[PDB]
Amino acid sequence: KAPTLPASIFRAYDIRGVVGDTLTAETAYWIGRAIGSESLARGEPCVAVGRDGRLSGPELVKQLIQGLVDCGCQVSDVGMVPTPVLYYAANVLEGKSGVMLTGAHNPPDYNGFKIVVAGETLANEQIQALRERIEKNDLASGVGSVEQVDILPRYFKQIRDDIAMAKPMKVVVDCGNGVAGVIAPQLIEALGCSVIPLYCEVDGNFPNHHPDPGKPENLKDLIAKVKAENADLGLAFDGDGDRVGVVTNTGTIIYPDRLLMLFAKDVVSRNPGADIIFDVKCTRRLIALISGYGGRPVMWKTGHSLIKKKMKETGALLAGEMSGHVFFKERWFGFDDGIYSAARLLEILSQDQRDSEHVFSAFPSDISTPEINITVTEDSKFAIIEALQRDAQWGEGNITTLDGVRVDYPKGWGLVRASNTTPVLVLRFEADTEEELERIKTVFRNQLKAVDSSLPVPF
Ligand SMILES: [Zn+2]
């Protein structure tokens, strides 16, 4: 009989916890039994399993593997690899299920499970179903097997063979002591670049900055190093390698919507009418740019899981979102991969005589506010958004209510949405001029006040 696990580790799309607290070796075993049971129930006995470079990785992955084996699954054990290399395995090996044991970009003691079953990721009720299986002892029992698989060379060669770099580039590569250190610097060198490594040693203690390029502060060392070495570009991978931060030769941070402008231009050039998915936090310039080149832009809900689901439903060739996940289907498999993104970026930049700063600066840029967060309460957060959706007046503008309220005007846009995990409203504004930016802020400030005249509006 399985033990009692804390419900708190079963999240919307994955499982996550703190080793020694909410996650133990024992937990990993039973999670494997649940995932294996569900995979068999979906007709898939073959499951790939990988882990990142965390201190708890070896111990916990061994239990995860045993739990899968104890259901009767045939496990393909790929060992320590980046998350996207595990995804690669689950696309090229016999089975379509895979489990990645990773705490991603989080502090050292965190770990967790990213799960794909019979070709799809689980969400919401499906992750809760795993929890339920354990609770009720609704688990398969069988005599499975494990095969050690060395997938990294295959992955390396698959990318190297398809990337066609032109001019040599000097690149600072910061892995934040996460698992991308096993391949990113090596692959980037193999493509033709000269690499300046920062924190490329795999060390689960994360003694330098945590591997999270989503926080600019975790790019300070990279920016300084690019400037000091007169490098052409800087890249910072997150801890498991499914995201990469980008810095130009002058230190400018390139956010995902601007990266997507560059990637979209390239993808659409060889694929007339290609669908390109992005989120409601992305610059409006992206919609126009994709359309101008003959693509079909789709502005969608925030969240990499939702973006991916929309990509699959539309047959899109490329997708990305502001938290940093980028998905290529063109020339690739459709899953998010920071290393592949880096390779695709290097390919494009290498074919342009301009420096990376100017390649990116040439795209239209507008005036933008830093993202705004308004602390409210858990009781009011969704209701404020709902009240706006029912009754707000936005004037002449294109209204999008897929995720909060976004309004696109001829000269700019605004967004207000509720955070899904904190009692906070999140806003963004952009416009072609300061005057238009202030006008749009005023529209939103006024609509918020029309919901609750006493709400604290910090803008
Ligand atoms: Zn990640």
Side-chain angles (χ1 to χ4, degrees), residues 287-323:
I287 305 164
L289 173 310
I290 291 162
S291 188
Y293 287 135
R296 183 172 183 271
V298 181
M299 181 167 63
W300 196 237
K301 302 168 179 179
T302 63
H304 68 76
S305 309
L306 292 176
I307 289 280
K308 196 196 84 191
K309 172 178 185 291
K310 178 57 78 162
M311 178 188 207
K312 296 198 164 177
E313 293 172 355
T314 56
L317 293 194
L318 173 70
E321 52 82 35
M322 292 292 299
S323 92

Side-chain angles (χ1 to χ4, degrees), residues 104-105 114 238-243 325:
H105 60 300
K114 294 185 180 184
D238 88 328
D240 62 328
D242 58 1
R243 297 188 284 123
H325 291 85

Side-chain angles (χ1 to χ4, degrees), residues 38 51 97 269 284 371 388 424:
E38 186 56 19
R51 68 164 175 92
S97 289
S269 79
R284 63 173 181 107
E371 183 166 273
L388 290 174
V424 167

